[PDB]
Design a protein around this ligand. Structure first.
Ligand SMILES: Cc1[nH]c(/C=C2\C(=O)N=C3CC=C(C(=O)N[C@H](C)c4ccccc4)C=C32)c(C)c1NC(=O)C(=O)c1ccccc1
Length: 503
C-alpha cells in the first residue's frame, strides 16, 4: 500500500547533492559492504560485474548455506563446495586462498565435518575483498548509488511520514498506535509518549535511555527501533509490530495452562538469543515476564518493554529496585549492586512458568501477599514436576540460583554457557538465528490475541534523531522499493541521476 506518488518521495537525488556525504561517511568495509543492508547488496551487485569477483560472493553464499545445513547432511554439502570452488581447474576457482589453505580444509573434510570448516577460507576471502575490490567499488557507480540511498535515509521524518491506524496498548506512560510508513507501506507500532507526562513525571532521561538502547541493538529477538521523531503533544517511537499476542496469553488462555517442553524450548532459545544481543551492549533488561515476550505473524518472539533497560558501564555495577513483583531477582529485591544477572533469573522464571503453567514462587490458584512472594524468591527453593525433564529441571535451578555468582550465564562466558546447557542439547542455534527452525505455533492473521522552555528543546534534539540506518534500509528492501528504484542504465551505463554531466 505505497503512496500514489511513492516514486517521487524516494526519488534519488542527483549525485551532485551527495558530495557532503562522500567526504564524511567512514569507509569501513564491514560497515559499507556487510552491516548496512543496502550497502551490502550494492557491493555484491558491483562484484557481479567483474568476472574474478563473482566466484567469491558465490562461495560466501555457499558457506552461509553450509553453516545452517543439518549435521547428517554436512559431509555432502562440504564436498559440494570443495569440488565447486576449491579445485584448481574449477570455473569459479577461489585464487586468494592459499594452496596451503585448501589442502588444510581437505584434511578437515577427510575427517569428521564441522560447522566452521570453511571459516578460515571465508576469512581469507574477506581479507581479500577488504583490499583491492573494496577500493575499486568505492570509485564505482554503485557506491555513488549507495550515497544516493544514504541521502534518502537521512531525510527528515515527521508526522506526515507515517499514517496512524489504531491504538493497541493504551495504558503505560503513553499509548501504542499502529503507524504505517506511507511511501513504502510498511507497518510499525507508533509508541506515543506525551511530552506533558514526561516533564511532569520528570523521567526524560528514561525516554532517552530506551530510545538509545533500542537504536543501538538490532536483534531478530528484540523489538527494533526504526524511527524516533517529535510531534505536537508527544514523542513517538516507531517500533516492530507484533501481531501474534504475548506469551502470557498463550501460556494461560491458549495453554494447559503451560506448554510442552519442546515448545518452551523454542521460545526460551529465542529469548536467550535476544538477551545475548542486549548483553553484547552491556545492557540489562530487568523486566523479563511473559507479557513482555510478544509473538509476530509467523510465531517468532521478541522482547518488548525496554522501559526498564539500562546500559551498565563496562567494569561497573548498577543499583535499582525495579521490576514486577514475583519477577525480581534476589539481588534486586535487596537493592544490591548487580550486573546482567537479573536477566538470567528472569529466563529461569520464564522457562519454569512456560513448562509448569505457574510461577515458581507463586501458584496460579494461590492468594499471597507480595511479602511472602518475595520471601520465597529469597529463601524458598522451587519445586519441579514430571513436566520437566532432568535437563529442564537443571537449567531452571541453575538460572534460579539465588547467588548471582553461582547463577548460570552470570559468568565471564555469558550466554554461551546457557546455550551449552543440556536443556538445549537438541537446539541448533545457528539455524534458529537464521530463522530456519519452524516456530511451534503460528498466529492466524485475522486473530485478536488479547512548556515553552529551552531545556525541553535540548531533550528533544537528542530524542528526535530520525530514521535508524539498518532498519530503514531493511524496510526499503522488504517493501521492494530498493528492487524498483535501484535501476541503472541499459547495458551497464551510468543512469542520468549518477552522471555528473547533466544535473
Ligand atoms: C500489534 C501490537 N503491538 C503491540 C505493542 C508493541 C509492539 O508491537 N512493539 C512494542 C514495543 C514496546 C512496547 C511497550 O513497552 N509498551 C508500553 C506498554 C508503553 C510504555 C509507554 C507508553 C506506551 C506504551 C509495546 C510494543 C501491541 C500491544 C499490539 N497489539 C496486540 O498485541 C493485539 O492485541 C493483537 C493481536 C492479534 C492481532 C492484532 C493485534
Amino acid at each position: 500500500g505505497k503512496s500514489k506518488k511513492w516514486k517521487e518521495i524516494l526519488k534519488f537525488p542527483h549525485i551532485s547533492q551527495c558530495e557532503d556525504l562522500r567526504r564524511t561517511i567512514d569507509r569501513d568495509y564491514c560497515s559499507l559492504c556487510d552491516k548496512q543492508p543496502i550497502g551490502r547488496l550494492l557491493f555484491r551487485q558491483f562484484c557481479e560485474t567483474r568476472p574474478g569477483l563473482e566466484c567469491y560472493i558465490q562461495f560466501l553464499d555457499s558457506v552461509a548455506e553450509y553453516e545452517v545445513t543439518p549435521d547428517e547432511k554436512l559431509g555432502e554439502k562440504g564436498k559440494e563446495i570443495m569440488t565447486k570452488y576449491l579445485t584448481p581447474k574449477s570455473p569459479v576457482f577461489i585464487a586468494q586462498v592459499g594452496q596451503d589453505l585448501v589442502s588444510q580444509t581437505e584434511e578437515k573434510l577427510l575427517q569428521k565435518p564441522c560447522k566452521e570448516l570453511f571459516s578460515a577460507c571465508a576469512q581469507s576471502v574477506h581479507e581479500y575483498l577488504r583490499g583491492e575490490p573494496f577500493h575499486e567499488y568505492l570509485d564505482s557507480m554503485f557506491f555513488d548509488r549507495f550515497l544516493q540511498w544514504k541521502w534518502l535515509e537521512r531525510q527528515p521524518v515527521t508526522k506526515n511520514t507515517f499514517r496512524q491506524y489504531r491504538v493497541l496498548g493504551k495504558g503505560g506512560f503513553g499509548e501504542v498506535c499502529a503507524c504505517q510508513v506511507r511511501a513504502t507501506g510498511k507497518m510499525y507500532a507508533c509508541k506515543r509518549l506525551e511530552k506533558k507526562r514526561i516533564k511532569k513525571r520528570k523521567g526524560e532521561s528514561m525516554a532517552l535511555n530506551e530510545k538509545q538502547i533500542l537504536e543501538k541493538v538490532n536483534s531478530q529477538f528484540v523489538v527494533n527501533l526504526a524511527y524516533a521523531y517529535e510531534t505536537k503533544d508527544a514523542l513517538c517511537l516507531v517500533l516492530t509490530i507484533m501481531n501474534g499476542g504475548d506469551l502470557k496469553f498463550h501460556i494461560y488462555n491458549m495453554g494447559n495452562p503451560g506448554f510442552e517442553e519442546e515448545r518452551a524450548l523454542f521460545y526460551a532459545a529465542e529469548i536467550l538469543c535476544g538477551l545475548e544481543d542486549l548483553h553484547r551492549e552491556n545492557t540489562v533488561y530487568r523486566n523479563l515476564k511473559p507479557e513482555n515476550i510478544l509473538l509476530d505473524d509467523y510465531g517468532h518472539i521478541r522482547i518488548s518493554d525496554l522501559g526498564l533497560a539500562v546500559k551498565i558501564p563496562e567494569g561497573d555495577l548498577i543499583r535499582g529496585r525495579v521490576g514486577t513483583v514475583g519477577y525480581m531477582a534476589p539481588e534486586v529485591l535487596n537493592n544490591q549492586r548487580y550486573g546482567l544477572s537479573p536477566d538470567y533469573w528472569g529466563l529461569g522464571c520464564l522457562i519454569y512458568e512456560m513448562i509448569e503453567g505457574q510461577s515458581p514462587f507463586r501458584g496460579r490458584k494461590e492468594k499471597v501477599k507480595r511479602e511472602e512472594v518475595d520471601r520465597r524468591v529469597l529463601e524458598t527453593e522451587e519445586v519441579y514436576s514430571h513436566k520437566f525433564s532432568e535437563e529442564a529441571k537443571s537449567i531452571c535451578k541453575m538460572l534460579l540460583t539465588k547467588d548471582a555468582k553461582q547463577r548460570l550465564g552470570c559468568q565471564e562466558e555469558g550466554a554461551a554457557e546457557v546455550k551449552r546447557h543440556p536443556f538445549f542439547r537438541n537446539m541448533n542455534f545457528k539455524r534458529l538465528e537464521a530463522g530456519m527452525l519452524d516456530p511451534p505455533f503460528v498466529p492466524d492473521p485475522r486473530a485478536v490475541y488479547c512548556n515553552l522552555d529551552h531545556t525541553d528543546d535540548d531533550f528533544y534534539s537528542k530524542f528526535s534523531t530520525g530514521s535508524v540506518s539498518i532498519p530503514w534500509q531493511n524496510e526499503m528492501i522488504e517493501t521492494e522499493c530498493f528492487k524498483e528504484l535501484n535501476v541503472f542504465g541499459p547495458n551497464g551505463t551510468l543512469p542520468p541521476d549518477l552522471n555528473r554531466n547533466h544535473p
